[PDB]
Amino acid sequence: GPLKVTTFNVNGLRSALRKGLADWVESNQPDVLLLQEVRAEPMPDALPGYHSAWFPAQKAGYSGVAILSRLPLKDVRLGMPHDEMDAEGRVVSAVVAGVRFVSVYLPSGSSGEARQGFKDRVLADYQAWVSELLAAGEPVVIGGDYNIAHREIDLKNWRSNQKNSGFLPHERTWMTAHLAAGLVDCHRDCLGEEAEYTWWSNRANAYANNVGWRIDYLLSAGVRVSGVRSDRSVRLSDHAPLTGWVELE
């Protein structure tokens, strides 16, 4: 049967656990869990019944990604390789049930010119890595915080953010090209034209008013991921878990 896959930027795994992440996992039982912004050193006992692969950043409390699964992992790959993205613990992958699952955390450029230029540069290198992965031809599912909203429908305040990191013209164009290289935006496919977000700031009732951005993605090639929605029944981090069904063949 199909596998339930969840991608989730936890904003610090220990913080998410304190808010109830293990309880959410106990109830929802994703077959594959792709985590971003783990921050912590590996915590293989945190979610009972899950095998885990961890790729922490060099800096304490910073970035870090992980893949957890109820089925055994195969060919765990830590990093790309890429000097800076590996130092920041931003990409991990493993094969589960014949599908290459990748957990990716792309950098924010919000802090200023320095990190925006970093983001622009490493996203070209990340695109090269993804395109080579697609040319290999094995089925792939990417769960990632990309820190990019694609179209106007993807953020409530689009008119006020066309000059802000995450919605800059070249970043929207990058996302179009990312999908055109051979990836389906599974949440958008499942939503049609409906608006749904994956991140809300902690400032000024933004979560309750649904003033959000869609910056987390489930992207697929060679396999369909259906039923994808954000889960807003919990507030385990600034993001919502994004979950759907991977229709294995």
CATH code of residue 116: 3.60.10.10
How many domains does the chain contain in total? Answer: 1
Q: What count of other Cβ atoms lies within 10 Å of the Cβ of residue 79?
A: 18
Please, which experimental method was used?
X-ray
Cα separation, 118 vs 56, in Å, equals 19
Cα separation, 217 vs 214, in Å, equals 8
86 carries an active-site annotation? no
Which residue intervals of the chain are DSSP H helices? 13-19, 21-28, 83-87, 113-136, 169-180, 186-191
Q: Are 154 and 196 in contact, with CB atoms under 8 Å apart?
A: no
Catalytic residue among 145, 154, 185, 216: 145
Cα separation, 209 vs 197, in Å, equals 12
Cα separation, 54 vs 102, in Å, equals 12
SS3 92: strand
Contact residues for 104 (Cβ-Cβ < 8 A; gap 6+): 36, 65, 90, 91, 126, 142, 143, 144, 145, 146
Q: Are 149 and 166 in contact, with CB atoms under 8 Å apart?
A: yes
Q: Are 88 and 57 in contact, with CB atoms under 8 Å apart?
A: yes
| DSSP classification of residue 152 | G
Residue 105 structural domain: 1-249
Cα separation, 37 vs 241, in Å, equals 13
